[PDB]
């Protein structure tokens, strides 16, 4: 150009520098891998997020448990108050005797909410009622009320957690539930490559109004629990979400991976309540591996055009830190093999 | 009891409907049947700004009719000089999931927000020579849909938790909250004199709010789906909406009723954005079938097509002096029509 003034050339060259930096930044992050989590409530997304951070980045320092003490205290007090509300919710009488008056007094005392440390009297009453046969039976009696599944862990270690000189550990911080509004993302370096994974939880709104923002992600991970096959059922709603996610017109080319959490809980509880409650059409024996294969079979048949895409399934136990690493190694191996370009 | 309240609400609905119907003697079409038609409107492409690397979700014109801002999903805000197609600033964001942007009427600030439930305000004129975050406003419990400056010190936001709010940028607390509403607020438009505004949601209704008190004055239930776009008429006595049922509609404040429905056959896609001309004669609307139609605002006839995009047109704006129209789309291009 020749008509350009003295100042305009500086503007043009600054625009060129901006273009160069923008191009460099754009192509720098165009080679990474983006995973995305979905599912229903209490499926276990945050658990595997914390597991991923523990494994592939670094551990947790001792100071983290200092601030997680408040949330674990809140979780265990909520669990015990839910238990003592549930024992009278069905009006099931128990052999409490003096423990009934103790329960009434501690229900009154539950409004303290100091969140610093339990009362020694409170801990003692909780301990002595925990030995009552009636409330113990009620704890496993009716799988109707929304009871946290970590209550069997938190209330079985009151002789350590309730002491003033108590600090949480990795196991304690892993089994800690919290509902936080907003998107959660975590990025880390693995296999000489950068991974970014999201967690769209707490977006209590219409999902179809923003799902198109994630068009063309590298992979989608679906988390489906198994221990909730007779909880008010929920597995039918999980399938009624899966058929909508899988048959989407946006996720035509994206490998879908299934995680089946809570496999140990399923193994424990499969010997009590038969699978016929959730699926009336089942007719096999009450054994573990056949029931799991049945779940897989009636959970895979919701995919149209199975020739084009195939879903990848694993049996993980996200609380256990050992079995997440191997499963993630397998899934990153298959996503690398499926992305040869 | 509850049932008596349901009958009271039904009788009130019948009374409001009858009072609106009782004052609808003549239609807008019969009165404006003798107006001469506009003719044919042919707009060419003047600019093809190409600097984004992902889908473009929002844009806004500056009040001096020369600068504009655009937001995209690669995590960048870019300020453009439309006369020379130069880039003035490029601002990286802390969250890449952005759905809206706004420009201050003075030119000093820029707003942004998205799936992080946070609205971020950026200062454009500082001694250090780089754009830095001035404040972050938090308190919504759902993704942020739209935001519009009222002043250099006040801003109005809407979110998917069925609420709107009015902010004080120095102080981190909401000054007014708007809660009577049932669906999800998706779009928002400020009046020219900045005392009222309208909001359109996915419960197929629109509401007129008063800023000073924060009360709803009128409610319009005429569409059959989600409402996706909204704009106020320049006169200040009417507004227009655009929805997912492939139909735009014009509502009138003073008569509190509906005047016209702008629909044509063979069109089965939704509308993403809507805007008026300076004299209120042409209405511009963007569709999912990759085109953009221009409507004669008094006669339901179609007066042209703008057909220069390769994907769905998502944002659209008209300058203050009315010299050009800018459209953005998911194919990562901006075009200037005149």
């Amino acid at each position, epitope marked *: 150009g020749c008509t350009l*003034s003295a100042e305009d*050339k500086a503007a043009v060259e*600054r625009s060129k*520098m901006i273009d160069r930096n923008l191009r460099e930044d754009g192509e720098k992050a165009a080679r990474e891998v983006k995973l995305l989590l979905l599912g229903a409530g209490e499926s276990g997304k945050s658990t595997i997020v914390k597991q991923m951070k523990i494994i592939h980045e670094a551990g947790y320092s001792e100071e983290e448990c200092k601030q997680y003490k408040a949330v674990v205290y809140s979780n265990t007090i909520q669990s015990i108050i839910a238990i003592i509300r549930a024992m009278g919710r069905l009006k099931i009488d128990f052999g409490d005797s003096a423990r009934a008056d103790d329960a009434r007094q501690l229900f009154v005392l539950a409004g303290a909410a100091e969140e610093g440390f339990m009362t020694a009297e409170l801990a003692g009453v909780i301990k002595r009622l925990w030995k009552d046969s009636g409330v113990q039976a009620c704890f496993n009696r009716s799988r109707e009320y929304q009871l946290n599944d970590s209550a069997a862990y938190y209330l079985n270690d009151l002789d350590r957690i309730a002491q003033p000189n108590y600090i949480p550990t990795q196991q304690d911080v892993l089994r800690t539930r919290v509902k936080t509004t907003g998107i959660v993302e975590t990025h880390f370096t693995f296999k000489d490559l950068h991974f970014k994974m999201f967690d769209v939880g707490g977006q209590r709104s219409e999902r179809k109004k923003w799902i198109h923002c994630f068009e063309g992600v590298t992979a989608i991970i679906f988390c489906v629990a198994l221990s909730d096959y007779d909880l008010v059922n929920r597995m039918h709603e999980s399938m009624k979400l899966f058929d909508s996610i899988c048959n989407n017109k946006w996720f035509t080319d994206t490998s879908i991976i299934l995680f089946l959490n809570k496999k140990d809980l399923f193994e424990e509880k499969i010997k009590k309540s038969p699978l016929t409650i959730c699926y009336p059409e089942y007719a096999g024996s009450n054994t573990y591996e056949e029931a799991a294969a049945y779940i897989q079979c009636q959970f895979e048949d919701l995919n149209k055009r199975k020739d084009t895409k195939e879903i990848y399934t694993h049996f993980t136990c996200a609380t256990d830190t050992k079995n997440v690493q191997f499963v993630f190694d397998a899934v990153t191996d298959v996503i690398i093999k499926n992305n040869l370009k | 009891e509850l049932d008596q309240l349901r009958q009271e609400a039904e009788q009130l609905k019948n009374q409001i409907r009858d009072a609106r119907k009782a004052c609808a003697d003549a239609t807008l079409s019969q009165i404006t049947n003798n107006i001469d038609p506009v003719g044919r409107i042919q707009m060419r492409t003047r600019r093809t700004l190409r600097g984004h690397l992902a889908k473009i979700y929002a844009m806004h014109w500056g009040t001096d009719s020369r600068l504009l801002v655009s937001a995209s999903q690669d995590g960048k805000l870019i300020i453009w000089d439309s006369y020379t197609t*130069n880039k003035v600033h490029a601002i990286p964001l802390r969250s890449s999931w952005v759905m809206t942007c706004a420009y201050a009427p003075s030119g000093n600030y820029v707003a942004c927000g998205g799936l992080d439930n946070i609205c971020s305000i950026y200062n454009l004129k500082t*001694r250090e020579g780089n754009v830095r975050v001035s404040r972050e406003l938090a308190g919504h419990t759902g993704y942020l849909s739209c935001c519009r400056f009222l002043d250099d010190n006040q801003i109005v936001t809407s979110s998917g938790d069925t609420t709107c709010a009015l902010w004080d940028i120095e102080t981190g607390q909401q000054t007014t909250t708007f809660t009577g509403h049932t669906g999800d607020v998706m779009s928002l438009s400020l009046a020219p004199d900045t005392r009222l505004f309208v909001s359109g949601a996915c419960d197929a209704s629109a509401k007129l709010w008063d800023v000073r008190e924060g009360m709803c004055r009128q409610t319009f239930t005429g569409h059959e789906s989600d409402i996706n776009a909204i704009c106020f008429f320049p006169n200040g006595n009417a507004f227009a909406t655009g929805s997912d049922d492939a139909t735009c509609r014009l509502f009138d404040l003073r008569a509190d009723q509906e005047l016209m429905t702008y629909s044509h056959d063979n069109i089965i896609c939704g509308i993403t954005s809507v805007s008026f001309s300076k004299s209120g004669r042409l209405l511009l609307a963007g569709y999912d079938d990759f085109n953009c139609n221009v409507w004669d605002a008094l006669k339901a006839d179609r007066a042209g097509v703008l057909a220069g995009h390769d994907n769905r047109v998502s944002c659209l704006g008209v300058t203050d002096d009315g010299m050009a129209v800018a459209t953005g789309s998911w194919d990562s291009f901006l075009k200037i029509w005149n």
Partner: single-chain antibody
Amino acid sequence: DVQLVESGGGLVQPGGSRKLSCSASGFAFSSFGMHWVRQAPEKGLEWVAYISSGSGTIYYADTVKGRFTISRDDPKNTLFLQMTSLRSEDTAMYYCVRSIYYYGSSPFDFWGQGTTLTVSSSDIVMTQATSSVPVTPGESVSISCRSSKSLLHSNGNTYLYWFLQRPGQSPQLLIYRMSNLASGVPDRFSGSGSGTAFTLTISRLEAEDVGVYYCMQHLEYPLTFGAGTKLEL
């Protein structure tokens, strides 16, 4: 805050060499273009050299071409000037000025301090009617600066700048492109005028505003100053 601190300079034997450095602190150094501006023990200012951002464009004055060299080191936030074959006409005081160019910016806004160098033992012409105009506090005055070639470009802008230097301080930007008031400057200053005839008007003149006023053109390189007009009580 924004700061530019200078060091170096001293007595030099003629024909020798020296180097001056300009260290910045308080702003994003790598996004600005830098200028070197020289003065004289009694004469006016004269532009010397200019380095862009990213070091992609270099200009030199007509009398120092082929001897002086300008450079920058972005990571350490330093600006360098290498000076060779020092002639006796280079005895001066050197200033380091920052400027940024985009739509609506204000170049030449911070000047910093100087360093003293003692070497001793087609251009547009701007005329500023150099003389002392006596003033008294309370009244209003006008200052004129006529050009030789019209400064109005075809894009509508007219590139004229006005500077004020109080006694024993560094120069300060007042008006850029004849009408726009710089940041932090009281609204008592007004600028107007047509092509090749410009005026600066001060109304209700206050105190501490005594000094020398300079007019500068930024239409095309090399940049040229005026002789400078003096205001005294």
